[PDB]
Amino acid sequence: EDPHLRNRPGKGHNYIDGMTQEDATCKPVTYAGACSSFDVLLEKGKFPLFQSYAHHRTLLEAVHDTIIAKADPPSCDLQSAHGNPCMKEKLVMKTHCPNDYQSAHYLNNDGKMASVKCPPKYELTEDCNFCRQMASLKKGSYPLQDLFCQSSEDDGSKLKTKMKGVCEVGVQALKKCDGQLSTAHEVVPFAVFKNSKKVYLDKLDLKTEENLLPDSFVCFEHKGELKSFDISQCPKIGGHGSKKCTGDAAFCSAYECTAQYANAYCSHANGSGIVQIQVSGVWKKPLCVGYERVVVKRELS
């Protein structure tokens, strides 16, 4: 029912630095065109958390909107002899890469965007851990995690993973465990906050406060086919702008509506709003929330 999933909050840039050959349809993503770093997120059921929060930012969008910092280095060369800095974090993740990707990206333990990358024209293997030779490569990067992001000033410097009975989750050793342990790949929820590391969680509990801020709207104009349109051009009631706009009841409560004189139509974005997450009993406003499938070791005997 939502026809505006490609009408992106923010700049809407779904490319990774160093892979710019599909900028025409990824920078920004919009109604028209294919984008190998974004289109996979909308395949029904593949990325269920993002699809529940699809008017929030992807990881690449959050990087280009300066909400999430890039890791140093920003891509790891999987081919390199004697290693790369991503290998430990990547190996504890169980991931499936489709064929023909040169790059795949993820939110690392420090809360920054890292990526693994193959040479030309090498593709990642199915487990995303190696490169192999391949008609032609995709021009973007495969998102390894199901997540979504938003801006936040809420300090998470005292927040840390606390998981009952867990000794290790991903690359995080949580506590001393000298007994015999059990091991499994688990799909674990996590969040990243201002000034925190990745916080893995026993349970994902989210709430959304809807509002009438700009990222709560999607605006479109007619290509002279729909085209994404920036609401910042639209005058507020009592204010000025550079364009004429119209929209739904929520839009017209705050913005001028000029009906048949409008250059664009704006409507409230389904599911948008400020997201908070419950973490060790307290609600906090995260930068990003997601799931990843990682090795987990639990106390046993």
Side-chain angles (χ1 to χ4, degrees):
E1 324 181 358
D2 191 341
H4 302 302
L5 299 177
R6 298 188 77 84
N7 188 326
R8 303 309 302 151
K11 291 177 193 136
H13 291 181
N14 287 265
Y15 73 94
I16 193 157
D17 287 339
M19 319 210 67
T20 60
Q21 277 95 314
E22 53 178 356
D23 280 4
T25 56
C26 292
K27 193 194 193 183
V29 165
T30 186
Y31 294 95
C35 175
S36 64
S37 311
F38 177 84
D39 299 345
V40 298
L41 302 166
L42 296 187
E43 296 186 16
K44 298 304 180 180
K46 289 296 177 198
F47 289 85
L49 184 67
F50 173 71
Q51 285 167 15
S52 296
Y53 294 88
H55 291 289
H56 288 79
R57 286 153 168 89
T58 66
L59 184 52
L60 298 173
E61 280 171 355
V63 166
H64 293 301
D65 288 340
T66 70
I67 294 165
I68 294 295
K70 307 161 50 177
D72 178 18
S75 58
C76 293
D77 171 24
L78 278 181
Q79 285 300 94
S80 170
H82 306 289
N84 68 87
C86 297
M87 214 59 245
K88 261 61 168 178
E89 287 168 333
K90 180 49 203 71
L91 284 172
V92 299
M93 302 169 70
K94 186 163 186 205
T95 52
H96 164 80
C97 283
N99 295 338
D100 296 322
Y101 279 95
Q102 200 185 344
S103 177
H105 55 276
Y106 67 101
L107 188 62
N108 72 4
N109 201 65
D110 291 326
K112 303 175 206 272
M113 188 179 65
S115 67
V116 297
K117 191 168 180 170
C118 294
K121 153 203 151 84
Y122 273 67
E123 55 174 359
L124 290 159
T125 55
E126 279 85 359
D127 69 355
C128 317
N129 290 326
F130 307 89
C131 299
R132 72 175 159 207
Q133 292 198 336
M134 171 80 181
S136 184
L137 291 177
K138 282 155 192 305
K139 296 165 190 177
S141 174
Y142 186 70
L144 291 176
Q145 303 150 313
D146 183 16
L147 61 75
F148 65 96
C149 302
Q150 67 182 352
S151 63
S152 179
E153 292 311 320
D154 190 17
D155 172 76
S157 65
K158 275 59 188 182
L159 301 178
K160 218 75 166 170
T161 300
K162 292 188 174 71
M163 287 178 81
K164 176 150 70 174
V166 169
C167 297
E168 298 181 52
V169 49
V171 302
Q172 296 185 16
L174 302 188
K175 67 192 193 189
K176 168 177 182 168
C177 293
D178 65 341
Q180 297 200 265
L181 314 177
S182 59
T183 301
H185 278 115
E186 301 179 10
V187 177
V188 187
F190 67 88
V192 164
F193 305 82
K194 180 173 172 162
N195 306 322
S196 83
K197 310 303 211 190
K198 185 181 290 161
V199 179
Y200 290 105
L201 307 151
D202 272 337
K203 186 177 170 202
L204 188 53
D205 287 315
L206 294 168
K207 65 182 191 174
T208 299
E209 175 188 356
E210 284 185 350
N211 57 57
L212 302 170
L213 299 176
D215 285 331
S216 288
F217 289 100
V218 281
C219 294
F220 67 88
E221 66 183 312
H222 288 285
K223 175 170 178 60
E225 179 170 300
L226 303 201
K227 187 172 151 201
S228 296
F229 178 100
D230 176 17
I231 189 170
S232 78
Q233 297 166 293
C234 300
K236 296 284 190 79
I237 295 166
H240 303 284
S242 58
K243 299 283 182 299
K244 292 186 175 295
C245 301
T246 203
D248 65 359
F251 181 73
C252 297
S253 78
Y255 292 82
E256 294 201 358
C257 285
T258 55
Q260 72 275 27
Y261 297 103
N263 303 123
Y265 189 93
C266 297
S267 51
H268 193 267
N270 194 43
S272 65
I274 287 177
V275 175
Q276 290 183 241
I277 184 172
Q278 214 177 12
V279 44
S280 302
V282 176
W283 294 96
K284 298 291 289 181
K285 192 179 155 181
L287 298 167
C288 299
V289 180
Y291 287 103
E292 61 184 349
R293 186 177 304 259
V294 286
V295 179
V296 180
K297 301 176 70 147
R298 291 174 178 268
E299 298 173 287
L300 192 66
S301 61

